[PDB]
Amino acid sequence: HNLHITEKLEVLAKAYSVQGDKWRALGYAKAINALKSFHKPVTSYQEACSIPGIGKRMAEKIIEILESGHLRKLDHISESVPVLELFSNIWGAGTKTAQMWYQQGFRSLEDIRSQASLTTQQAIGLKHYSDFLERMPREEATEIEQTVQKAAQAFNSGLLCVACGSYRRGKATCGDVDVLITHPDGRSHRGIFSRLLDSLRQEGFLTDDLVSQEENGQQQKYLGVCRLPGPGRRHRRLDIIVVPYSEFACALLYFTGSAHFNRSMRALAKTKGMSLSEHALSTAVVRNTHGCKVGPGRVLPTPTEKDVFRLLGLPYREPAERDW
DNA sequence: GCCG
DNA sequence: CAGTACG
DNA sequence: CGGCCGCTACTG
Ligand SMILES: [Mg+2]
Ligand code: NA
Ligand code: NA
């Protein structure tokens, strides 16, 4: 499509991201996205600007890659970037921890492993470094959801379990497995993480826990690591959320994504005096001059994903159509 | 970074 | 709270 | 000028 140019930009977008320049990186993330989805290749400056998500600043650079064949901005990128990227790829460590480790003189995982102070999460992230960077065939994602569902329906056959994220969007491979668990009656889902997690631990399915507030009966999510039985099995990331039935649709929509899809949909809802989150879609929300939800509006009835789209004056989209 |  | 994370 | 998703959910 425009790979000759986007591949160069992605490098730049990733550099800003790891350095903590969140908004600039988002800028490139949207320009790079627009290009990759533009039918024909770009050839003119005006041809660029005309595109949404691309402005003068960007259009100018898109020129280079074509005429100049290469972007000269990529030649002055700090030598620190590759190391920052290496560091931030450790689950539990972000741009702030990466830059701190770098300022401290660390340059490799060997340095991190032997000299860095690690949080419980980062220690787990490091021990599964390569695994956390791989994707799994969707078939395996199925085996995992099935494993979780079986264990859950074991103590309550009424429990509804669904694999979301990239899986539900129908991608061939998945980074992790997102399992949404809820119950049709609307109450039989409270305080089950304890039973579910312990059940999964019994059979040795779960290998490590990253995020799991179990001392609290109000736990909403579980982020961990699991591994299927047998030879040739890798450790996989597992994310589970348990939600009340009334919030099923918003939860399903959220967990299905994509992330960028979710953000775009939420941005639209805000322009219409509404608010969308994984818990609910509300209308008549009260916002300050900075657009922050100060006053609550009214929660709208949203029994199905269809309803959320409808209420936002949007054509429904199949999961595969939300793969932004 | 782009957009209103 | 700041950091990092989920889609 | 200033928002860019969520009054998102944990961790320490
Ligand atoms: Mg996923
Ligand atoms: Na990380
Ligand atoms: Na815990």
**Cα maximum dimension of chain A:** 65
Residue A149 and residue A220 share a domain = yes
Of the three residues A91, A117, A134, the one that is the final residue of a domain is A134
If you measure CA to C1', which residue is closest to nucleotide C2?
A96
Experimental method: X-ray
Q: Is A201 annotated as a binding residue?
A: no
How large is the angle between the packed helices A95-103 and A3-18, nearest 10 degrees? 70
Catalytic residue among A30, A61, A150, A221: A61
Q: Are strands A173-174 and A176-182 parallel, antiparallel or unpaired?
A: unpaired
The token pair at A40 is 């024909």
Of the three residues A257, A288, A316, the one that is the final residue of a domain is A257
CATH number at residue A209: 3.30.460.10
Q: Where are the alpha helices (DSSP H) in A37-137?
A: 45-49, 56-67, 81-88, 95-103, 109-115, 120-127
Q: Are strands A274-276 and A206-211 parallel, antiparallel or unpaired?
A: unpaired
The angle subtended at Cα A88 by Cα A219 and Cα A212, nearest 5°, is: 15
Residue A11 and residue A55 share a domain = yes
β-bridge mates for residue A178, sequence order: A239
CB atoms within 10 A of CB A6: 21
- Contact assessment for residue A179 and residue A141, using Cβ atoms and an 8 Å cutoff: no
Of the three residues A203, A231, A257, the one that is the final residue of a domain is A257
Chain C bases closer than 7 angstroms to a protein Cβ: 2-7
- Contact assessment for residue A202 and residue A216, using Cβ atoms and an 8 Å cutoff: no
Residue A288 and residue A248 share a domain = no
Residue A103 and residue A152 share a domain = no
The angle subtended at Cα A260 by Cα A83 and Cα A186, nearest 5°, is: 115
DSSP readout, A60-83? HHHHHHHHTSS-GGGGS--TTHHH
Residue A88 and residue A70 share a domain = no
Taking the CA of A91 as reference, the closest ligand is 2
A213 touches strand D (CB under 7 A): yes
CATH number at residue A96: 1.10.150.20
Residue A270 and residue A247 share a domain = no
* Tally of CA atoms within 13 A in the half-sphere of A286 that contains its CB: 4
Residue A145 and residue A245 share a domain = yes
CATH number at residue A27: 1.10.150.110
Determine whether A215 is exposed, middle or buried from the number of CB atoms within 10 Å of its CB (0-12, 13-18, 19+).
exposed
The angle subtended at Cα A24 by Cα A18 and Cα A27, nearest 5°, is: 115
Q: Are strands A236-242 and A176-182 parallel, antiparallel or unpaired?
A: parallel
A30 touches strand D (CB under 7 A): no
The SS3 call for residue A239 is strand
Taking the CA of A133 as reference, the closest ligand is 2
- Contact assessment for residue A231 and residue A212, using Cβ atoms and an 8 Å cutoff: no
| Cβ-proximal residues to A196 (8 Å cutoff; 6+ apart), any chain | A148, A151, A152, A155, A181, A240
- Contact assessment for residue A25 and residue A17, using Cβ atoms and an 8 Å cutoff: yes
Cα A27 from chain centroid? 18
Say how far A285 CA is from D5 C1', in Å: 15
Residue A63 and residue A25 share a domain = yes
> Length of chain A in residues, anyone?
324
CB atoms within 10 A of CB A22: 11
- Contact assessment for residue A160 and residue A311, using Cβ atoms and an 8 Å cutoff: no
Spatial CA neighbour of A29 closest among A20, A17, A41: A17
> Which residues neighbour ligand 1 (ion) by CB within 5 Å?
A 165, 176, 178
Residue A166 and residue A89 share a domain = no
Residue A28: which nucleotide is closest by CA–C1'?
Answer: B1
Residue A1 and residue A46 share a domain = yes
The token pair at A314 is 């949007």
How many Å apart are CA A238 and CA A223, to the nearest integer?
A: 6
Residue A154 and residue A234 share a domain = yes
CATH number at residue A303: 3.30.210.10
Spatial CA neighbour of A279 closest among A191, A220, A238, A197: A220
Taking the CA of A222 as reference, the closest ligand is 3
DSSP readout, A159-195? -EEEE-HHHHTT-SEESEEEEEEE-TTSSTTTT-HHH
A88 touches strand D (CB under 7 A): no
For residue A56, indicate whether it is catalytic: no
- Total domain count for chain A? 4
How large is the angle between the packed helices A95-103 and A81-88, nearest 10 degrees? 130
Ligand 1 geometric centre to CA of A177 (Å)? 5
Residue A114 and residue A154 share a domain = no
Q: Is A169 annotated as a binding residue?
A: yes
Say how far A39 CA is from B4 C1', in Å: 27
Domain residue limits at A200: 135-257
